[PDB]
Amino acid sequence: SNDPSGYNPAKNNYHPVEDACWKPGQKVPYLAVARTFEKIEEVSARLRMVETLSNLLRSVVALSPPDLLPVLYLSLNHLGPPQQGLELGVGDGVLLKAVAQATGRQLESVRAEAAEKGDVGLVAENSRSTQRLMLPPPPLTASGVFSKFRDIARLTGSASTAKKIDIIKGLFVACRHSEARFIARSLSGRLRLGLAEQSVLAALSQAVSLTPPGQEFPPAMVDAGKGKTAEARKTWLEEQGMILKQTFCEVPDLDRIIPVLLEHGLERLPEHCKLSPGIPLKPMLAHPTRGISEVLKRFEEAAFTCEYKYDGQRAQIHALEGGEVKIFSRNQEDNTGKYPDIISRIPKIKLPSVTSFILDTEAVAWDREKKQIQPFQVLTTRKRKEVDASEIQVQVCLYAFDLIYLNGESLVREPLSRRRQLLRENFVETEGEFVFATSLDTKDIEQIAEFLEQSVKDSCEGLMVKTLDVDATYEIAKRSHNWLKLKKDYLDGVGDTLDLVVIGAYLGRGKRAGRYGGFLLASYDEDSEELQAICKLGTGFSDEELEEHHQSLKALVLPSPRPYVRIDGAVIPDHWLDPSAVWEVKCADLSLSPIYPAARGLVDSDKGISLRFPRFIRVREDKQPEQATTSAQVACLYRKQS
DNA sequence: GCTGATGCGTC
DNA sequence: GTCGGAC
DNA sequence: GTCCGACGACGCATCAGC
Ligand SMILES: *OP(=O)(O)OC[C@H]1O[C@@H](n2cnc3c(N)ncnc32)[C@H](O)[C@@H]1O
Ligand SMILES: [Mg+2]
Ligand SMILES: [Mg+2]
Ligand SMILES: [Mg+2]
Ligand SMILES: [Mg+2]
Ligand SMILES: [Mg+2]
């Protein structure tokens, strides 16, 4: 009702009508969304964030139902269903230019402040706009802002960037209080609330459970939990939370779910939104494990299967009744246009009795001349959009490992033993085109160790381990990481570790604001007696170790780089460091780099070598730079991968 | 018509 | 993708 | 164990700038 500036969606006994900061039927103000973001950001307990978001959503349901979908998208920082491919195309560069123009400041001055503060939002809000007149424009609304975000994402073609900057400036001109901070963070793709998809779903089921949609105004039922004991309320909300969560994992599309929720309610939701081919679903993921002993501990006495973990890209393959075929990525992006070859071979992989299906597969680059798997880096050279089958140069072999839907039957609640059997009996293998994941059903620790050894020898990353009957379903809402990934480089003493020289540091963003978030590392090239940048590094250290690194490196800061340090195309560090510290670094593999100079010319004329999945292990106090891993040793390690 | 910077995607 | 922090 | 956001290499698609 009153000024949204005082809106407190975190207040005790929050009343969806009386504590709202707008009137019935009015559009939700964006400042209401922003104050909710502030109250979420101030706390660290997710459950407190969920209650706060729930309070906002209850007011939205009660007062302004049409703004529910935009508010949810704003809270996720999404533009729409992932398979529709809406993208801002903005990024820090465009955003920082728009902030500069809106405030009249120099781009470079804005850039330096952002790096220092580790946050663009604070730079955007703390500086006023030259564009603004004496009179402010009307206040921003949640749906107004969301549609402008969509406008940005739809702009294409020549001069589209200028048009994007104009929209962004228009937004900043109208911002009040904390609004610009979250507009800017949203545009840069770093909203960083500490609340995301799972907490948004929890807030949404709680909200529509406590404040049902569809009530004649004023709503007779503002809080449907008030008549319940605390224990009964909790059980009820957990039950309703799982209805929404399991539906969303089968149909992760708020454009479909929300209209149903507002019309028919949450209890009827599964009868209106169900898994079907053509709608991407959430995939089953995996937890790491440190060794075979641990696998047996997590699965106890449950029979399990081991499978090769292939190194390609996940492909969720849908065949609709009537013949249409769709392919989606692990993240529900539409990849149908990328695999014309796969689409044309569907008739060859399925027996003629199969009328529809959803397969879970790995797409792996395959050398038809040598009949062998190719590295991930080869796979990534495929074109991605509007590919014509004749133009394909990198062939793919599909390694199928699960089946989620068959002939109109959803298999989500079926044990893997049965899903696998339907997969094996209704689909046809062809060497180099479509094959079942190589597997072993055993409890013998010795066979597992060999089978692991062999998976590496056969061009794979290690093993995936899955129970067959006990907790062996495909219900992502019950456990999204139900499988176990046993990679060689997880083992504490088998992976390849390098001793690398710290040559630069990058100021941290977000959670790393105010310290270093990343470092530039180098190997030692003994031929030229120079240090060659090899990779950046930003994970593996605890917060405590990261504080010690800032302490021990601050004395090594230099105004200018050393002439025997070569970084070529790498990101220039915010702070150059006198080469001295040597860290032990682990990786999964070495890759051919278009930018890093380390070992350039030893394996390839144009490309140096970098690290795949690098992480800090520990400081090497017993090593000086001249004894770090050499560039020749790096080349030798790369060749060793064959 | 070409190239480079870069946003977004894959991992 | 890996990793650590807060719960 | 869950959920989240720090941070990694790298390649296609796109568009500003030539
Ligand atoms: O490393 P990670 O957590 O992303 O691993 C999960 C991914 O591994 C791929 N993959 C390859 N082979 C398999 C099998 N046999 N089973 C399950 N997943 C597999 C997937 O692409 C998955 O996303
Ligand atoms: Mg997307
Ligand atoms: Mg775009
Ligand atoms: Mg930076
Ligand atoms: Mg993989
Ligand atoms: Mg560590």
Author numbering: 260 to 901
What do the study authors state?
Of the three human DNA ligases, LIG1 is established as the replicative ligase, completing ligation of the >50 million ligation events during DNA replication in addition to ligation events during DNA repair. Human DNA ligases utilize the energy of ATP and catalyze phosphodiester bond formation to seal breaks in the DNA backbone. X-ray crystal structures of the three human DNA ligases (LIG1, LIG3, and LIG4) in complex with DNA have revealed a conserved ligase three-domain core architecture that encircles the DNA nick, induces partial unwinding and alignment of the 3′- and 5′-DNA ends, and distorts the 3′-OH strand into a C3′-endo sugar conformation to adopt an A-form like geometry. Unexpectedly, we found a conserved Mg2+-binding site that forms a junction between DNA ligase domains and the 3′-strand of DNA.
Structure determination with a 3′ dideoxycytidine (ddC)-terminated substrate facilitated trapping of the LIG1 complex as the adenylylated–DNA intermediate, poised for nick sealing (step 3). The location of four coordinated Mg2+ ions (Sites 1–4) at the protein–DNA interface were clearly delineated when 200 mM Mg2+ was present in the cryoprotectant solution. Site 1 is coordinated at the three-way juncture of the AdD, DBD, and the DNA phosphodiester backbone. For reasons further elaborated below we refer to this cation as the high-fidelity Mg2+ (MgHiFi). A second Mg2+ (Site 2, Mgcat) is coordinated at the active site where it presumably acts as the catalytic metal ion. The Mgcat metal-binding site has a slightly distorted coordination geometry, with five of the six octahedral ligands present. The DNA 3′-OH is absent from this structure, but based on positioning of the deoxyribose ring, the 3′-OH is predicted to provide the sixth Mgcat ligand. Mgcat is positioned to stabilize the pentavalent transition state during the nick-sealing reaction in concert with R589, which forms a salt bridge to the 5′-phosphate and the bridging oxygen of the adenylylated intermediate. The octahedral coordination of the partially hydrated MgHiFi involves interactions with the phosphodiester backbone between the −3 and −4 nucleotides (relative to the 3′-OH of the nick) as well as two glutamate residues from the protein, Glu 346 in the DBD and Glu 592 in the AdD. Structurally, MgHiFi mediates key interactions with the 3′-hydroxyl (3′-OH) strand, appearing to restrict the conformation of the strand in the ligase active site.
